[PDB]
């Protein structure tokens, strides 16, 4: 109930005029008070529409101001252009900043003036520094300045923060006021005519620097921020790569005293094991050279922090490093050109001096792995291989974005990248031809996409036709199925929903063991991903073809084979200005259904082959190998204790034995630590990277102004948990300015805390971080019932596309390819289902979501709605709440810290209850109703849809399942077995878990199966109503946890819930009408 | 390696407790015994492989024939079954008997 005050103060500060008037609007669940609210509304509109003072009425209707619930605030203020400068002149009396063109290697990667690089607008491009975000620089400046103004009179540590951030904002605003502010257009782009006379990279620098200075709480933070903001103004290509590089070595210097272990995907079992750090001497020289480059670039304080730490190498002072490791990724993206970014990859040194003893073993191991993956289904004639075509044709929605192509659905033209739509187009014009796989050669080279991530190189993405997906789908899915239970594949080994996110290194760490970890992200243009890689798979396919008797399977195998033939010679469209280059690239990259598992295979075989050469000079026992994409690690144990020289010699031998296969590598050997893309360990403690740029994005998505605010709050939560903390008030200011909507040129609306923090498709944040909020009140129930009535909307584009002829043809062909003679009973179901996967096409989603937002705004303006009894979650919690009783408890501390970077309250919880050990279906996949869909398809259906489907008669369940590609006999068998009554409970478990973010955010990190949390939860047992006791225990757990988070202390609970209410609620169970947004989830693991 | 007769080595003094600190110096013996306990915890092996913690509890539940979704209530048989406790007990018992 404080957010709205900051909204009011922001409004008062930004507008400031006599003409600027401020108009709240309220609502109440009680009829009489509601009519009094309507009255208040009326009188407010009139008085505003008559230039009368509003401050007078606010007293007469004090009751509405005190007890009713706010929605929004209007604002009447005219243009009043250029007020940003009229505020900013005061914070800019320092000196502006001068670029240095001789810092970056290239010419255009310097922060020089646009006209010095793009005299003509016809060759101008804002794409090398496009923020790609629907929020303005002026927004950011207003927010920063408002924060500075409200914290302009405090005298405490807060003032020590204020002086620091004020100096930083001075550094920024001096540079800005030297020239001026670029003005955003309607599309939030920045045209030539504003940047024509200004530095090209001022905007990205500005946003990143604002984001940093809003994340300064200490002296060392100030040093880091002042040392990057002034250097990120010129260097924009060689900065995050620099400071983020030494970290990989530092982790190899921290002695373990206490460890965490893994067993199964979230299991832990700590160890009091002590392990030293046998680091050789030459890596210190490496680190010294790295710090010398760091100083040579112009860095003084941050080498000093990295230099004074090495005297002790302690893990208590170490989070600074981790903090530093996150301060590198909040400087921005290196959005350079497609060409020069590709040439980071497209440099090749291919030689007729490598072994053949090595490549032949490599090829053979790949062959054998392929056969191990595919022996059983190829032999037992599995349905998904026979009908691989239709399987891929249904799962096209889970594919990559094909090249843009001009379609027409009756009487329109569309430029979709979605491959299902391509298939729909090509079926009509006789072009659908899945057996003829297109070549990829001089006559038809491949486009590209760029996979970026700051502080690293740019990776490339193939953008293929839609035949390759269809061919690869079924076989790669069977390969994944094989890899679910294989230990060595760390991208997949789990129990059907989790990943090995905590790593599996620390089992066999000891004084006798070592571990070699290695980055393998540059190994795409390499000589070992060309011919041998492809030919191994071709050989395996030949074996498998001779290992089957059915013909559909052999056809599928021959198509996957021919795909591998064609990918062996592959050219690449890359523009450079007007003309287009096409380069011979007979190698591997992403943009394929195959790249992930196949790269894991090839890296596994490669390391198995190399690791049998150290054996020529050492005796060791390979304990564990793991491969996950852009890294891989193998642990190995010796007959004796480890020394520095064995580490050195093992590393040199690994490097040279990779060189024998013409393979570059920074070989890294250690005893306690690793560093990889997604995580890293020091001293037996897992850290994470907090590198998510908020005010700058990688590319331009398709969501609205609204949803990006939710995304930004989620990224804030993530980075906070990671360690990188930004001042929350800034985030709230951005959220209000991004949820602000213009009803006219001068009318503008601003929603409130009770619209943005309520569980719906419009949730954006929470009043208290790390805590979803529910509703015990009339009013939250009231607006939630209201908003569910409005979430369901239409898209005319989808309606007209689905009414054309090509859509009908596609449905007809699906049918007669699956089943026939029910053209008006099931086929409509399949068309209705295809509608569910047209919505992936972005303009459809925009039409529908903008419609929802408009419907929301046309009831923020006018009074409120009763919504007609539609049951939701807060309806249930409203009835559960009045039979609780809290009492102060006191739990002790008995669980170990292993994620230091967390906030101290979350850690206090982890330090009092356990960390999670299981994982329940967030997608409802293990449910026996879902194991049919996961057998004949990949499709998700959301747990809302399943939760509804079970509530229906036993008839339409069959139609709904058949519409998802399933046949009729197994659906009939599912209904006859009566397993859905055995599956209501699993579906509801997953539903309730998804609604309340238990597997999304902080609550993903907590053990609710604990004995310690449970002894507080004293709910006696009644029996024969499982849903009620389930929700009761869950809700009580959430109560205890939220009280803990917001107040630290603990409490007990008690609910002697009457049987009458048990039964009254049992029927409200499977009639819930609620829904939560995808954009609101904040996965701690990205 | 073979070591010559030119070589030498010094032997430690491993003569037992001349003081009998287990005779009415309980505050010191508490510290000594705690030190040896925590040292012994650092050498007891971790239980590298077990049976999974959910593939067990369903077998237990069907043996017990329990109401559905009692998993989150943990009918008292099923409380604190996790690993991170089995290793803890295995470690504690041995380290205690040693110290």
């Amino acid at each position: 109930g404080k957010y709205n005050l900051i909204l009011s103060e922001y409004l008062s500060f930004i507008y400031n005029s006599q003409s600027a008037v401020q108009i709240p609007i309220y609502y109440s669940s009680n009829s009489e008070l509601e009519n009094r609210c309507i009255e208040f509304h009326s009188k407010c509109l009139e008085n505003s529409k008559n230039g009368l003072s509003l401050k007078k009425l606010f007293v007469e209707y004090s009751d509405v101001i005190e007890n009713a619930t706010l929605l929004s605030i209007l604002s009447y203020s005219y243009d009043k252009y250029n007020a940003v400068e009229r505020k900013l002149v005061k914070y800019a009396k320092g000196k502006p900043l001068e670029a240095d063109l001789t810092v970056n290697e290239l010419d255009y990667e310097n922060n020089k003036i646009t006209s010095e690089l793009f005299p003509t607008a016809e060759e101008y491009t804002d794409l090398l520094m496009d923020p790609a975000i629907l929020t303005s620089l002026s927004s950011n400046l207003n927010a920063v300045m408002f924060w500075l103004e409200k914290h302009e009179n405090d005298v405490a540590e807060k003032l020590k923060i204020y002086k620091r951030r004020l100096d930083l904002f001075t550094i920024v605003a001096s540079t800005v006021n030297k020239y001026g502010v670029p003005r955003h257009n309607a599309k939030y782009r920045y045209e030539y005519e504003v940047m024509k006379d200004k530095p090209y990279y001022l905007v990205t620098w500005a946003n990143s620097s604002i984001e940093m200075l809003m994340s300064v709480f200490s002296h060392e933070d100030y040093l880091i921020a002042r040392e990057l903001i002034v250097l990120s103004y010129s260097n924009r290509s060689t900065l995050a790569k620099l400071v983020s590089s030494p970290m990989s070595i530092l982790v190899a210097l921290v002695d373990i005293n206490g460890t965490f272990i893994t067993n199964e995907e979230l299991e832990l079992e700590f160890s009091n094991k002590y392990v030293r750090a046998i680091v050789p001497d030459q890596t210190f020289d490496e680190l010294k050279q790295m710090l010398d480059n760091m100083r040579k670039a112009g860095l003084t304080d941050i080498p000093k922090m990295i230099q004074d730490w090495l005297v002790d190498c302690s893990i208590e002072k170490f989070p600074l490093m981790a903090k530093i490791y996150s301060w590198s990724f909040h400087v921005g993206f290196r959005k350079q050109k497609m060409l020069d970014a590709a040439l980071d990859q497209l440099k090749t040194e291919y030689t007729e001096d490598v072994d053949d003893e090595m490549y032949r073993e490599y090829t053979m191991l790949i062959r054998d792995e392929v056969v191990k993956m595919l022996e059983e289904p190829v032999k037992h004639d599995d349905h998904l291989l026979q009908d691989s075509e239709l399987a891929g044709l249904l799962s096209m929605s889970s594919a990559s974005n094909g090249e843009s192509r001009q379609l027409k659905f009756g009487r329109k033209t569309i430029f979709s990248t979605k491959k299902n739509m391509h298939v729909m187009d090509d079926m009509a014009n006789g072009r659908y031809t899945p057996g003829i796989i297109p070549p990829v050669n001089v006559d038809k080279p491949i486009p590209l996409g760029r996979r970026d991530v700051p502080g690293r190189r740019t990776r490339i993405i193939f953008i293929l036709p839609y035949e390759y997906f269809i061919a690869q789908h079924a076989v790669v899915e069977k390969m994944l199925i094989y890899a679910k239970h294989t230990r060595e594949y760390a991208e997949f080994y789990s129990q059907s929903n989790q990943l090995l996110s905590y790593g599996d290194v620390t089992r066999f760490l000891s004084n006798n063991s070592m571990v070699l970890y290695t980055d393998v992200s540059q190994w795409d243009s390499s000589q070992h991903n060309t011919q041998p890689f492809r030919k191994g798979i071709i050989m395996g396919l030949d074996m498998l073809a001779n290992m089957t008797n059915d013909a559909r399977v052999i056809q599928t195998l021959n198509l996957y084979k021919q795909t591998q033939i064609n990918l062996m010679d592959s050219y690449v469209q890359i523009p450079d200005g007007n003309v287009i280059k096409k380069i011979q690239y007979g190698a591997v990259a992403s943009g394929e259904k195959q790249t992930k598992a196949a790269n894991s295979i090839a890296n596994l075989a490669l390391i198995k082959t190399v690791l049998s050469r150290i054996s020529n000079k050492y005796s060791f026992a390979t304990k564990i190998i793991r491969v996950d994409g852009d890294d891989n690690y193998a642990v190995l144990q010796f007959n004796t204790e480890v020394t520095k020289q064995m580490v050195q010699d093992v590393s040199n031998d690994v490097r040279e034995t990779y060189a024998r296969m013409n393979t570059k590598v920074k070989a890294l050997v250690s005893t306690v630590g690793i560093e990889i893309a997604k995580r890293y360990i020091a001293g037996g403690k897992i850290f994470f990277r907090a590198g998510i740029n908020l005010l700058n994005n990688e590319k331009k998505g398709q969501s609205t102004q609204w949803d990006q605010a939710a995304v930004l709050y989620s990224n804030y939560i993530v980075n906070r948990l990671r360690g990188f903390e930004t001042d929350r008030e800034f985030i709230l200011t951005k959220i209000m300015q991004m949820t602000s909507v213009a009803i006219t040129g001068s009318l503008r609306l601003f929603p409130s805390e009770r619209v943005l923090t309520t569980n719906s498709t419009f949730k954006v944040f929470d009043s208290e971080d790390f805590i979803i909020e529910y509703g015990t009140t009339d009013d939250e129930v009231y607006i939630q019932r209201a908003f569910m009535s409005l979430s369901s909307q239409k898209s005319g584009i989808a309606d007209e596309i689905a009414a054309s002829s090509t859509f009908k043809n596609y449905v007809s062909r699906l049918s007669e390819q699956l089943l026939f003679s029910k053209n008006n009973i099931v086929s409509r179901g399949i068309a209705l289902t295809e509608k569910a996967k047209l919505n992936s096409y972005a303009p459809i989603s925009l039409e529908k979501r903008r419609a929802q937002i408009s419907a929301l705004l046309t009831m923020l303006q006018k009074p409120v709605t009763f919504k007609s009894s539609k049951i939701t979650i807060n309806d249930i919690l409203r009835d559960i709440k009045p039979f609780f009783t809290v009492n102060e408890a006191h739990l002790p501390i008995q669980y170990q810290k292993f994620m230091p970077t967390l906030p101290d309250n979350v850690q206090y919880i982890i330090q009092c209850i356990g960390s999670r050990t299981y994982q329940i279906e967030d997608d409802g996949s293990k449910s026996a109703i879902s194991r049919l869909i996961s057998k004949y398809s990949v499709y998700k259906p959301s747990i809302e849809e399943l939760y509804k489907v079970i509530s229906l008669h036993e008839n339409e369940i069959q139609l709904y399942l058949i519409s998802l590609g399933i046949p009729k006999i197994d659906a009939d068998t599912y209904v006859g077995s009566k397993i859905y009554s055995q599956d209501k409970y699993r579906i509801l478990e997953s539903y309730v878990y998804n609604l309340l973010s238990i597997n999304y955010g902080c609550y993903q990190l907590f053990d609710f199966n604990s004995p310690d949390l449970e002894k507080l939860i004293r709910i006696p047992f009644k029996g024969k109503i499982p849903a009620v006791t389930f929700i009761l225990h869950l809700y009580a757990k959430l109560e205890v946890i939220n009280h803990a988070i917001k107040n630290g202390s603990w409490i007990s609970l008690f609910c002697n819930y009457p049987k009458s209410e048990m039964i009254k609620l049992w029927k409200k169970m499977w009639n819930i009408t609620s829904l939560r947004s995808p954009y609101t989830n904040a996965n701690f693991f990205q | 390696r073979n070591l010559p007769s030119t070589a030498r080595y010094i032997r430690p003094n491993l003569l037992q407790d001349r003081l009998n600190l287990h005779d009415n110096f309980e505050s010191l013996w508490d510290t000594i015994t705690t030190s040896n306990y925590i040292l012994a915890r650092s050498v007891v092996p971790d239980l590298k492989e077990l049976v999974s913690t959910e593939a067990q509890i369903q077998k237990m539940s069907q043996d017990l024939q329990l109401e559905a979704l009692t998993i989150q209530s943990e009918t008292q048989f099923l409380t604190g079954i996790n690993s991170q406790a089995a290793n803890d007990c295995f470690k504690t018992l041995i380290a205690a008997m040693l110290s």
Partner: peptide, 28 residues
């Protein structure tokens, strides 16, 4: 400058001395 740099090289030698290496070195 570089005097302190050589001291940085040096102070990371005396610390963390391993025993097997000095044994084989005494013998060798």
């Amino acid at each position: 400058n570089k005097e302190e740099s050589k001291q940085l090289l040096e102070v990371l030698k005396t610390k963390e001395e391993h025993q097997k290496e000095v044994q084989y070195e005494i013998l060798q």
